[PDB]
Design an enzyme around this catalytic site. Structure first.
Site, short mmCIF file in Angstrom:
data_model
loop_
_atom_site.label_atom_id
_atom_site.label_comp_id
_atom_site.label_asym_id
_atom_site.label_seq_id
_atom_site.Cartn_x
_atom_site.Cartn_y
_atom_site.Cartn_z
N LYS A 183 0.80 -1.16 0.00
CA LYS A 183 0.00 0.00 0.00
C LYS A 183 0.84 1.22 0.00
CE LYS A 183 -3.33 2.96 0.34
NZ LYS A 183 -4.29 3.11 -0.79
N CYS A 190 -1.39 10.02 -6.84
CA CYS A 190 -2.71 9.91 -6.10
C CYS A 190 -3.83 10.94 -6.54
CB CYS A 190 -2.46 10.10 -4.65
SG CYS A 190 -4.06 9.91 -3.80
C1 LIG Z 1 -9.04 0.43 -3.53
C2 LIG Z 1 -7.87 0.95 -4.39
C3 LIG Z 1 -6.74 1.43 -3.78
C4 LIG Z 1 -5.67 1.91 -4.52
N1 LIG Z 1 -4.58 2.41 -3.84
C5 LIG Z 1 -3.52 2.80 -4.55
C6 LIG Z 1 -2.29 3.14 -3.87
O1 LIG Z 1 -2.27 3.09 -2.60
N2 LIG Z 1 -1.34 3.59 -4.63
C7 LIG Z 1 -1.36 3.59 -5.99
O2 LIG Z 1 -0.33 3.90 -6.66
N3 LIG Z 1 -2.49 3.27 -6.68
C8 LIG Z 1 -3.54 2.86 -6.02
N4 LIG Z 1 -4.64 2.44 -6.70
C9 LIG Z 1 -4.60 2.42 -8.12
C10 LIG Z 1 -4.25 1.07 -8.66
O3 LIG Z 1 -2.93 0.73 -8.24
C11 LIG Z 1 -4.34 1.05 -10.16
O4 LIG Z 1 -3.37 1.96 -10.69
C12 LIG Z 1 -5.70 1.42 -10.76
O5 LIG Z 1 -6.70 0.80 -9.90
C13 LIG Z 1 -5.91 0.90 -12.22
O6 LIG Z 1 -5.75 -0.50 -12.31
P1 LIG Z 1 -7.06 -1.49 -12.43
O7 LIG Z 1 -7.75 -1.05 -13.73
O8 LIG Z 1 -6.51 -2.84 -12.46
O9 LIG Z 1 -7.91 -1.19 -11.20
C14 LIG Z 1 -5.73 1.90 -5.97
C15 LIG Z 1 -6.88 1.39 -6.65
C16 LIG Z 1 -7.94 0.93 -5.90
C17 LIG Z 1 -9.13 0.41 -6.69
O1 LIG Z 2 -7.08 6.82 -2.42
C1 LIG Z 2 -6.07 6.01 -2.48
O2 LIG Z 2 -5.56 5.55 -1.46
C2 LIG Z 2 -5.54 5.84 -3.76
N1 LIG Z 2 -6.43 5.49 -4.71
C3 LIG Z 2 -6.02 5.43 -6.10
O3 LIG Z 2 -6.79 5.14 -7.01
N2 LIG Z 2 -4.74 5.73 -6.42
C4 LIG Z 2 -3.81 6.12 -5.46
O4 LIG Z 2 -2.67 6.42 -5.81
C5 LIG Z 2 -4.24 6.17 -4.12
BR1 LIG Z 2 -2.93 6.62 -2.80
#
Ligand SMILES: Cc1cc2nc3c(=O)[nH]c(=O)nc-3n(C[C@H](O)[C@H](O)[C@H](O)COP(=O)(O)O)c2cc1C
Ligand SMILES: O=C(O)c1[nH]c(=O)[nH]c(=O)c1Br
Ligand SMILES: Cc1cc2nc3c(=O)[nH]c(=O)nc-3n(C[C@H](O)[C@H](O)[C@H](O)COP(=O)(O)O)c2cc1C
Ligand SMILES: O=C(O)c1[nH]c(=O)[nH]c(=O)c1Br
Lengths: 313, 313
Positions: free
Chosen positions: B44, B131
């Site tokens: 995370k 983010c």
């Molecule tokens: C619940 C959730 C939490 C996420 N938290 C982060 C995070 O902490 N840091 C980050 O770089 N991206 C975060 N993302 C983004 C994902 O890493 C990813 O870039 C984005 O969901 C697109 O990929 P997907 O189409 O497979 O969901 C998060 C996405 C979701 C759905």
């Molecule tokens: O709200 C989040 O924790 C979150 N959620 C995202 O979709 N991308 C991120 O980089 C992050 Br840090």
């Protein structure tokens, strides 16, 4: 119950219209959209001179939507103006004319000539600030200083009410800045959100190939892919531009989808990809379906729910 | 036939991992990802201090993908560092640690402390410049001067190979500028494309309400909505950053989606929304499905097709 409404000193039978560029390039197209049950139509974005546009294949559609890099193929401003001035039957529905010059000077040149036809006939200008498909010409509205220059020069040269076709934004600071630019211009009476989600890339697994020819396969996305992005943008601008109208475009396939755009703040609802795929019969279906949702919920008018999307606490 | 890769001086059984934020916040989550069939895992995104994040509901999923405004909830840097330093079984698979400080100074503070652990244990830094969900913090990678500052300060303070988590772009000029920025920093060895498509808005028609509580319902989109956006950004950076690796993220639900990513130039392939919905069993499925496509096509290794997407003409 009927869906009729009045906006911009015109009357509309329903809030539905084509999205610019779809079913609106030729006289045939425009007569077809006129004969449909849409509440209005908009012409293909035009340039001072005719353009063939990009090499084929340049549009492809898929279950979740479309990709296009058409390259602003059009018949030239002289044609669209003549359509507006002499051929369109204004007794059927209002017309918007989309202009998409490749420089500020080109747009000023067109708007100076459109002005007398807008005074005489009531044709409405939609200024396109968001073409994502012409090589070397990035979307104007992603450069806020360029957007301001374009809106200063057009406003001065045109002198009449007009609207702007906006690209989608993805950042709250962008929404803040873009809306404050628009709000500097009292002649901008409507904001159409959104143009295609720029420069996506569709790849066919079997052939291992991109699916459109121009720009190495890169093109604007429309359809089911973009509905939440479109809704966000419609609501963002509806919240930030309380003295302007917001027209919704993006991801409309159903009455239910139109209902959401209108809840987000949309006055008119424009239909691109789904119209390209289904044809003009889609307008009677959309109208039937929106009426049906309204009846089930007890709404009698659009105004009762426009912009009334609820938030949590 | 083989899913193996060797990069950044590490060996991977296969190219799949979680996307940061999914199934990686607690020790439990991390042990679960370690026990799965993934080739790697990423923690995370963390801040110096623990964070509760935004109010619930803050994540919601639908057939075409997900929306989230989590608000960077996390157990704090001290916990993820300790995880990397004492708890992670590196004989199982490599570990990436995502850092997402809210200022350059917070980032620098963290990477100074991470460095000796990365040197000793071989933990890999993913710096989150994207983010889209903390209010009043527009994402760093959308301000190219800020981005450059972050990368200069982090490179100088960390002094080791790292990678960056990039937002999606939608404009060729932005691809050009962002990649050029990244190319300034030789310690940036990988580029993860993409984070969630920012500030979309999902609206429920029945309740007439947004579906997440924070930010009036605005949140980042993942899943099926974003695949062509993600493929475009993977390829754009693959083409522009020939001396760096590109990790794909966005819209992966199947071995076929992973194949597209890889064709587009991806090294590792990250799984967010589909992993959140399906659970860590997805990894054996994605492996089997990718192997099936390779076998049908006669491909024996990933490098036989990585980056080999065909363009037209
Ligand atoms: C619940 C959730 C939490 C996420 N938290 C982060 C995070 O902490 N840091 C980050 O770089 N991206 C975060 N993302 C983004 C994902 O890493 C990813 O870039 C984005 O969901 C697109 O990929 P997907 O189409 O497979 O969901 C998060 C996405 C979701 C759905
Ligand atoms: O709200 C989040 O924790 C979150 N959620 C995202 O979709 N991308 C991120 O980089 C992050 Br840090
Ligand atoms: C084939 C095609 C051509 C288009 N031409 C234009 C145009 O000339 N001017 C313009 O403002 N938008 C144009 N667009 C964008 C659409 O007006 C619309 O903003 C976008 O397709 C999103 O709506 P949708 O989800 O209903 O397709 C075009 C879209 C398509 C698919
Ligand atoms: O390539 C097109 O012609 C086109 N395609 C789009 O998706 N939006 C536009 O504004 C234009 Br002008």
């Amino acid at each position: 119950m009927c869906l009729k409404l009045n906006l911009l000193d015109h009357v509309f039978a329903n809030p539905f219209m084509n999205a610019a560029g779809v079913l609106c390039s030729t006289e045939e197209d425009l007569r077809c959209m006129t004969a449909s049950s849409s509440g209005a139509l908009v012409s293909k974005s035009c340039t001072s001179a005719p353009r063939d546009g990009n090499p084929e294949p340049r549009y492809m559609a898929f279950p979740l939507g479309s990709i296009n890099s058409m390259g602003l193929p059009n018949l030239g401003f002289d044609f669209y103006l003549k359509y507006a001035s002499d051929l369109h039957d204004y007794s059927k529905k209002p017309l918007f004319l989309s202009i998409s010059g490749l420089s500020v000077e080109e747009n000023v040149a067109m708007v100076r000539r459109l002005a007398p036809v807008a005074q005489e006939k009531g044709v409405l200008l939609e200024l396109n600030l968001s073409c994502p498909n012409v090589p070397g010409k990035p979307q104007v509205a992603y450069d806020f200083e360029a957007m301001r220059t374009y809106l200063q020069q057009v406003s001065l040269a045109y002198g009449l009410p007009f609207g702007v076709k906006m690209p989608p934004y993805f950042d709250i600071a962008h929404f803040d800045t873009a809306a404050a630019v628009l709000n500097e211009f009292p002649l901008v009476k409507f904001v159409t959100c959104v143009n295609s989600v720029g420069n996506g890339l569709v790849i066919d697994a079997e052939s291992e190939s991109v699916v459109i020819k121009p720009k190495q396969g890169f093109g604007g996305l429309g359809g089911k892919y973009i509905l939440p992005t479109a809704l966000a943008n419609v609501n963002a601008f509806y919240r930030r531009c309380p003295d302007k109208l917001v027209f919704g475009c993006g991801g409309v396939y159903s009455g239910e989808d139109a209902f959401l755009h209108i809840l987000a703040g949309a006055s008119m609802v424009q239909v691109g990809t789904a119209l390209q795929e289904e044809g003009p019969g889609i307008f009677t279906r959309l109208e039937d379906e929106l009426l049906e949702i309204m009846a089930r919920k007890g709404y009698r008018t659009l105004e009762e729910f426009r912009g009334r999307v609820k938030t949590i606490e």
